[PDB]
Amino acid sequence: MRISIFGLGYVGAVCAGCLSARGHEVIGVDVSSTKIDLINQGKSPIVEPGLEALLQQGRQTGRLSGTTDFKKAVLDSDVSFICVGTPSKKNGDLDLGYIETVCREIGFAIREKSERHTVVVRSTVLPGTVNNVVIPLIEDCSGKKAGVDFGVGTNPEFLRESTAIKDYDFPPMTVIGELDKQTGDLLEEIYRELDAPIIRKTVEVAEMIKYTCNVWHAAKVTFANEIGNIAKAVGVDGREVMDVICQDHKLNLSRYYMRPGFAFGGSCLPKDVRALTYRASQLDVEHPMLGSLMRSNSNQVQKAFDLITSHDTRKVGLLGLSFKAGTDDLRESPLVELAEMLIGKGYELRIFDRNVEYARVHGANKEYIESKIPHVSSLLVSDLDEVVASSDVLVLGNGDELFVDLVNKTPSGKKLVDLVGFMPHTTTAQAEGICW
Amino acid sequence: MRISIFGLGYVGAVCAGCLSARGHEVIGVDVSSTKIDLINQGKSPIVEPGLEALLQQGRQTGRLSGTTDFKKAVLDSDVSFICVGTPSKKNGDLDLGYIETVCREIGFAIREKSERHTVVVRSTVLPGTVNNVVIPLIEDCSGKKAGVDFGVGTNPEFLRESTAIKDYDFPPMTVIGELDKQTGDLLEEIYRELDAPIIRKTVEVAEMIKYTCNVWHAAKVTFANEIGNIAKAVGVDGREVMDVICQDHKLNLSRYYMRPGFAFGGSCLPKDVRALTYRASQLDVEHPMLGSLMRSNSNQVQKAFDLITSHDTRKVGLLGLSFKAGTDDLRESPLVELAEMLIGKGYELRIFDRNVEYARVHGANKEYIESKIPHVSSLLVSDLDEVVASSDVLVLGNGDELFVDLVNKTPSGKKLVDLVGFMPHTTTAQAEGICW
Ligand SMILES: Nc1nc2c(ncn2[C@@H]2O[C@H](COP(=O)(O)OP(=O)(O)O[C@H]3O[C@H](C(=O)O)[C@@H](O)[C@H](O)[C@@H]3O)[C@@H](O)[C@H]2O)c(=O)[nH]1
Ligand SMILES: Nc1nc2c(ncn2[C@@H]2O[C@H](COP(=O)(O)OP(=O)(O)O[C@H]3O[C@H](C(=O)O)[C@@H](O)[C@H](O)[C@@H]3O)[C@@H](O)[C@H]2O)c(=O)[nH]1
Numbered sequence: 001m002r003i004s005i006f007g008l009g010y011v012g013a014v015c016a017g018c019l020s021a022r023g024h025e026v027i028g029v030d031v032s033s034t035k036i037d038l039i040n041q042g043k044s045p046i047v048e049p050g051l052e053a054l055l056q057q058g059r060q061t062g063r064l065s066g067t068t069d070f071k072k073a074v075l076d077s078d079v080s081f082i083c084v085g086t087p088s089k090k091n092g093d094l095d096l097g098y099i100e101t102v103c104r105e106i107g108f109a110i111r112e113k114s115e116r117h118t119v120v121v122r123s124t125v126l127p128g129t130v131n132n133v134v135i136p137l138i139e140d141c142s143g144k145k146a147g148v149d150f151g152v153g154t155n156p157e158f159l160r161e162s163t164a165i166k167d168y169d170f171p172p173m174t175v176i177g178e179l180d181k182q183t184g185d186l187l188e189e190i191y192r193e194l195d196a197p198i199i200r201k202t203v204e205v206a207e208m209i210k211y212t213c214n215v216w217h218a219a220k221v222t223f224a225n226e227i228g229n230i231a232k233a234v235g236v237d238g239r240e241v242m243d244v245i246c247q248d249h250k251l252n253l254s255r256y257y258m259r260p261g262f263a264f265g266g267s268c269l270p271k272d273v274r275a276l277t278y279r280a281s282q283l284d285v286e287h288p289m290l291g292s293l294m295r296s297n298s299n300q301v302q303k304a305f306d307l308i309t310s311h312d313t314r315k316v317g318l319l320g321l322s323f324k325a326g327t328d329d330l331r332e333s334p335l336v337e338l339a340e341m342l343i344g345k346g347y348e349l350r351i352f353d354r355n356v357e358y359a360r361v362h363g364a365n366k367e368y369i370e371s372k373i374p375h376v377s378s379l380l381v382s383d384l385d386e387v388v389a390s391s392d393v394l395v396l397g398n399g400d401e402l403f404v405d406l407v408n409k410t411p412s413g414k415k416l417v418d419l420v421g422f423m424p425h426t427t428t429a430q431a432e433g434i435c436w
Numbered sequence: 437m438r439i440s441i442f443g444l445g446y447v448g449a450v451c452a453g454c455l456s457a458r459g460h461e462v463i464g465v466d467v468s469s470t471k472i473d474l475i476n477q478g479k480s481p482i483v484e485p486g487l488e489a490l491l492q493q494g495r496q497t498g499r500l501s502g503t504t505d506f507k508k509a510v511l512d513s514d515v516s517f518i519c520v521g522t523p524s525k526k527n528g529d530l531d532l533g534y535i536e537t538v539c540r541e542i543g544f545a546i547r548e549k550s551e552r553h554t555v556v557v558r559s560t561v562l563p564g565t566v567n568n569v570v571i572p573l574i575e576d577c578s579g580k581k582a583g584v585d586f587g588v589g590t591n592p593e594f595l596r597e598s599t600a601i602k603d604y605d606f607p608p609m610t611v612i613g614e615l616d617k618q619t620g621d622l623l624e625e626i627y628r629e630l631d632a633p634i635i636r637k638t639v640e641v642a643e644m645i646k647y648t649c650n651v652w653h654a655a656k657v658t659f660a661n662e663i664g665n666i667a668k669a670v671g672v673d674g675r676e677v678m679d680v681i682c683q684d685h686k687l688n689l690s691r692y693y694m695r696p697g698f699a700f701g702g703s704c705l706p707k708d709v710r711a712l713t714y715r716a717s718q719l720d721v722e723h724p725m726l727g728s729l730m731r732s733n734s735n736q737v738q739k740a741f742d743l744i745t746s747h748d749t750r751k752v753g754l755l756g757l758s759f760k761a762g763t764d765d766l767r768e769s770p771l772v773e774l775a776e777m778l779i780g781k782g783y784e785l786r787i788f789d790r791n792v793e794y795a796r797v798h799g800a801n802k803e804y805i806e807s808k809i810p811h812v813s814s815l816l817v818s819d820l821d822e823v824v825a826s827s828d829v830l831v832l833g834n835g836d837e838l839f840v841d842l843v844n845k846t847p848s849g850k851k852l853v854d855l856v857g858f859m860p861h862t863t864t865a866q867a868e869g870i871c872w
Contacts, residue, residue, distance in 0.1 A: 010765065035800045045800035047764040047791045088707050092714035124708065126715050127670045158687065161702070162762030172684035199680055208670065208677045212663050213688060214708040215726060216681060219659050220693035221700045222729050225736050227648050228696020228871025234563045236641050237862050238696035238871035244635055244645050245652060246691035250608035251594065252649060253689050255682035257656035260664025260674035264657045266597065267446075271524045272560060272650040278528035279562050288732040290651060292724035296658050299722050303665070326598030328483035329446065355483045364471050364481030426673050435664025435674035 001186075003027065004077035006102045007084030008035045008066065010046055011122065011157050014164040015081060017054030019190075020064035028066035029073045039066035050165050070102070074109035079118045079186060081155070082134075086123055094126060096133060103134050107141025110150060118151040118183050124214070127207040130154055130177070151183030154203050156210035175199045177206025219289075226287045230276065233283040260435035262397065262419040263300035265323040267331035270294070300434075301337050307417050307432060308338075308393055314348040317391025319406070320398030320420075321353035321380070328359035330368070335397045339376050351379045352387045354402070388414065396422050437461070437626070440513035442538050444471050444502070446482055447558065447593055448519035450600040453490030456500040458629075463509045464502040472502040486601045506538075510545035515554035515622060517591070518570075522559050530562060532569055539570050543577025546586050554587035554619050560650070563643040566590055566613070587619035590639045592646035610634045613642030655725070662723045666712065669719040696871035698833070698855040699736035701759040703767035706730070736870075737770050740855055741777055743868055744829055747851050750783045753827030755820070755842070756834030756856075757789035757812075764795035766804065771833040775812050787815045788823040790838065824850070832858050843867070 002025040005016050013028070016039070020026040028039050035045045042056035042064075058064025067073060074080060084098040099121075110117055119138065121130055135146045146152045154177035159167045174191040176198065178184035184200055191198060201209065228238025245252050264270070273293050280287045308316060323333040330336055342349045357380065359365050369377045381387050384402070388394060393415045396403050407422040416423070416431035426436050437460045441448050444466040452475070456462040464475050474481050478492030494500025503509060510516060520534040535557075546553045555574065557566055571582040582588050590613030595603040610627040614620030614636055624634055637645065664674025681688050700706065709729050716723045744752060759769040766772055778785050793816055796805045805813050817823045824830060824842060829851045832839050835858075843858045852859070852867035862872050 010763075032800065038800060043798070047762070047795055047799065049762060085703075086707075087703070088710055092710040093718075094707070094711045124704070126711060127672065158684075160687075161765055162760055170686075172686040172688065173680070175680065197683060199683065201676070201680070202672070204670070205672045205676055205680075208667055208672055209680050211708060211712050212677055212681050213684070214705060215663070215712055215729075216659060216688060217693050218700055218705045218709050218729050218733070219655070219725075221705075222732050223652065223655055224694045224696045225699070225871065226732060227651075229739070231644060231696070232863070232869070232871050234640070234644065236563065236638075236644055236872075237869075239857055240637070240641060240872075241644050241648055242694050242696055244609075244611065244637070244641075245648050246694050247633060247635070248594075248608040248649065251596075252608070252652055253691070255679075255689070257653045258660045258678055258682055260660045260667065260678050261657075263661070264654055267521070268560070268650060269654045269657075271522075271530075272647055273654045274524055274528035275530050275562060276647050276651055286732075286735055288728040288735065289655070289725060292728045293651070293654055293658050295724040296662060297654075299724065300661050324598055326483075326485060327446075329597055359483055363483065364468065364474060421675055427668075433668070433673075435661065435668045436676075 001025070001079055002077040004029055004073040004080045006070075006080060006082050007098070007123070008039065008045065009083070009085060010048065010161050010164060011159055012083035013039070013045060013055070014048065014051060014159055014168060015083060015122070016064060017051060017058055018165065018168045020058040021054050024063065025077070026058065026064045027073045027077055028064065029068070029070060030066065031068065033068055036066035036068055039064070048164055049162060054165070070105035071109040071112075074106055074117060075113050078115075079120065080106060082119065082121045082123050084123055086125060096125075096129070099123060099125065099134065100137060103137040104141045107138040110138070110142040110144060116150055118186055120152075120183065120187065121154045122157050124156065124210055125207060127204045127211070129207060130203045147180045151180050151186070153178045153180070153183040153187060154206045155187055156206060158213065170194075171196045173197045173199055175201065175206055175209055177201050177203035179203055222289045226290045229285050229287065230280045230283070233280070233285045259421060261421060262304060262434065263297045263334040265332045265334040265337075267329065270297070270332050301334055301341070304338055304395070304417070304419055304434060305341050307434065308342070308395055311393055311415050313392040314346065315390070315392035316342055316347050316349050316395060317387040317393070318342075318349060318351045318395050318397055319387065319403050320396065320400055321351050321356045322398065325399035325401070326355065328355045328363060328365060330356065330365070330373070336373065336376055338397070339379070343375060349379050350381050350387050350391055351376070352381060352384055354382070354400075356380060357382050393417060396420055437515060438513040439463070440465060440509040440516040441519055442466075442506070442516060443519035443521065443559070444475060444481065445519065445521060446484065446597055446600065447595060448517070449475070449481060449491070450484065450487060450595060450604055451517060451519060451558070452500060453487055453494055454601065454604045456494040457490050460499065461513070462494065462500045463513055464500065465504065465506060465509045466502070467504065469504060472504055475502040484600050485598065490601065506541040507545045510542055510553055511549055513553070514551075515556065515587075516542060518555065518557045518559055520559055522561060532561070532565065535559060535561065535565070536569065536573060539573040540577050543574040546574070546580060547578045552586055554589070554622055556589050556591045556619070556623065558591055558593050560592065560646055561643060562647070563640050565643065566639050583616045587622065588615045589613055589619035589623060590642045591623055592642060594649065607632050611642050611645055612636045613639040615639055658725050662726050665721050666716050666719070666723065669721045670715070695857055697857055698740060698870065699733045699770045701768045701770040702765065706733070706768050737773055737777075740774055740831075740853070740870060743853050743870065744778070744831060745781065745783070747829050749828040751826070751828045752778055752783050752785050753823045753830045754778075754785065754787045754833055755789070755823065755831060755839050756836055757787055757792050758834065761835040761837070762791070764791040764799065764801070766792065766801070766809070772809070772812055774831070774833065775815070779811060785815050786817050786823045786827055787812070788817055788820050790836070792816065793818055829853060832856050
């Protein structure tokens with residue numbers, strides 16, 4: 001197909017060439033006549049391994065060209081890939097300036113041409129951008145309507161600089177955000193030949209996706225730095241430490257621990273986090289990320305409390321009490337924290353937990369349950385249907401498989417608050433998730 | 437093997453059972469008489485899938501028993517595993533009360549004992565605990581010297597409650613902290629049949645290994661929760677978002693981005709960290725972790741500074757300028773920032789980077805290099821030898837392989853400051869690493 005590409009920076013030029021070398025008619029579009037002159041000369045504006053070669057191949061076959069003429073580029077192509085920059089404003093919000101101009105330029109170019117055009121955003125933008133800005137802009141400028149007259153979708157890239165090409169060739173995944181089915185299919189052909197999954201989501205979800213990947217990346221670099229700093233301070237090598245950790249593909253580098261949900265608890269995570277940062281503090285090793293964990297963890301408890309507590313009623317049924325399903329361990333259980341908050345603030349609380357139950361007559365914790373936390377434990381009710389019937393707000397606190405059935409057999413008159421993720425879908429006025 | 441286990445809690449009881457199911461002789465020991473008794477009836481003190489059944493089998497083959505007679509346990513076994521809990525003190529630090537107690541008794545036991553007894557610590561303890569607490573208390577109480585007379589070693593655990601047994605039978609890996617080969621071999625013979633890599637390291641490293649793993653899990657949950665919160669405030673399901681993130685094993689769930697070293701930079705990571713948090717703020721969504729990345733990131737740059745400016749010499753050579761090797765992209769390069777700080781402090785700064793040097797000749801970002809950051813670029817030097825020779829302190833800022841030679845065979849009279857990880861080993865008087 002014939003592709004126009006708006007913005008010829010690191011991702012735009014890489015695109016220009018990668019597509020042009022696969023059999024596409026590619027028109028590189030940029031505001032600066034230096035980048036374009038370089039392109040027509042078949043030369044790379046950047047130092048990127050193997051880019052020049054690709055670009056020179058684009059001119060030799062006549063499959064690639066550049067022009068500063070936006071309108072033409074549109075009228076001469078069937079698909080436009082938006083790759084212009086979105087730099088930071090002085091307050092952190094991203095500057096949409098460039099994106100807007102391109103959008104206008106495109107809309108104006110469509111007002112003319114009668115055939116359908118396809119506008120795919122690749123530039124990283126906050127969620128809601130395509131819907132609240134690029135669409136209405138194009139529309140208001142083309143006098144047309146997104147979806148019906150012209151296609152719109154988003155297409156995040158994950159190219160790294162200095163390996164943009166190989167990243168292009170072998171991506172982790174290909175993700176597509178679609179308004180119209182038609183625009184989605186076009187992208188599907190485009191990456192059809194790539195040995196990686198294709199993931200079709202709504203425009204917004206896609207926008208969130210690319211942002212999360214990037215912040216996760218900084219999160220990782222940050223972790224390794226803070227850990228390495230503590231390492232040096234205590235005499236060992238961070239590199240050696242992080243290597244071993246990167247060996248674990250069951251916990252450290254899997255999807256485990258990555259489900260958005262409730263605070264973490266137990267008799268290990270919170271103490272070790274406290275134990276290592278205290279030590280870091282003794283060695284004069286600052287550590288803002290490591291040192292914000294607990295703070296965040298508590299926020300999450302508070303959050304559940306604010307959700308549960310917002311329905312004009314004291315009647316709460318708390319399903320799950322141990323720090324996690326399948327164990328009776330109550331040590332630093334966020335659910336007890338939660339329970340204790342509700343009690344301290346006067347709520348009519350009723351609790352269900354068959355494991356904590358079994359333990360009240362079958363363990364080495366009897367003492368603790370009847371003398372250490374009687375104000376919590378005496379609120380335990382073993383009849384699950386009783387807890388549901390006499391509560392107004394039902395709170396799914398842990399992964400007990402028994403709570404699924406509950407999630408699909410919920411009676412009228414009850415609010416659900418989901419903290420682990422049993423809900424098949426997103427919040428409604430009757431059922432709310434802490435992160436959905 | 438005859439194995440004694442001190443601390444019949446969640447970790448110790450599981451160990452007792454699994455070990456004994458594997459044909460060893462196990463003496464469970466704990467301070468609580470009520471614990472020992474449930475163990476002698478083959479009953480489980482805790483609610484943990486399949487533990488009871490293991491404990492009864494342990495009894496029924498006479499391969500597993502229990503007592504409070506510490507001395508007897510050490511006297512009738514060749515190796516002990518220390519599994520006593522380590523609780524938090526009001527200040528976050530670790531309470532070695534229980535560990536110490538169990539160390540004293542053992543020492544007293546191995547004294548009266550002629551043959552080599554082997555001590556393994558499974559309890560999670562800070563780096564250096566074993567060298568400065570366990571060994572000394574046992575040496576003292578036993579009159580014997582750690583290493584030659586009795587074996588010592590560290591051996592963390594990654595079992596997760598509720599899947600403890602599965603986790604024991606199928607671990608991510610086995611980590612051995614060894615002092616004397618003898619104990620290291622002993623542990624390996626035990627875990628030989630486990631389908632996982634065995635990792636042998638110095639005590640201090642394994643101690644730091646286990647900790648890093650726990651705080652890393654706590655960070656994953658933390659990242660995931662804070663992302664889901666923002667996800668939900670922006671209208672989408674944080675779960676749909678986190679599933680996709682977890683579908684990427686090249687960048688997201690891989691070892692990339694996990695090398696301790698220098699702050700991140702470039703025109704994407706920092707810009708995106710700032711944008712998301714900015715949005716997060718607009719929406720009243722607290723995010724202590726996400727929101728601390730930049731301070732921490734910026735605290736790494738300053739860290740590199742302090743390293744460099746501590747050598748009583750104004751002559752500094754910065755090898756690498758662009759945000760990474762393989763590109764000339766200068767946007768928000770931490771190396772540039774480093775340079776500007778060094779400049780503002782009046783250092784004789786010389787800079788090598790073959791990519792930018794090339795870029796300021798071919799490419800499109802020459803204006804920036806020439807007219808926007810002249811005060812950095814005129815400190816450029818084309819010849820790497822010229823920079824190395826005329827500087828007293830060399831900085832390895834990015835991973836350009838050209839710098840490998842400099843570190844393998846370094847001209848005397850130079851101080852090395854390794855920001856990326858070229859050094860084969862730890863810090864010395866001539867070559868200092870940022871996280872090693
Ligand atoms: N929000 C959220 N929370 C999670 C997720 N996965 C687990 N959690 C929670 O994180 C906390 C820790 O649970 P987990 O690590 O499964 O169990 P446990 O704490 O018993 O085991 C951990 O400590 C052991 C230990 O140090 O003794 C470790 O060995 C072990 O590997 C774990 O790190 C729990 O409160 C969990 O609910 C998730 O995807 N999302
Ligand atoms: N300390 C440390 N720093 C690292 C490591 N790995 C990478 N870095 C740094 O993290 C920063 C980003 O590098 P990288 O992600 O490899 O390059 P780039 O930032 O150009 O690509 C990223 O931005 C693209 C984008 O959003 O446009 C993404 O698409 C892409 O996937 C990356 O996130 C750099 O400053 C790196 O130095 C590490 O293990 N340790």
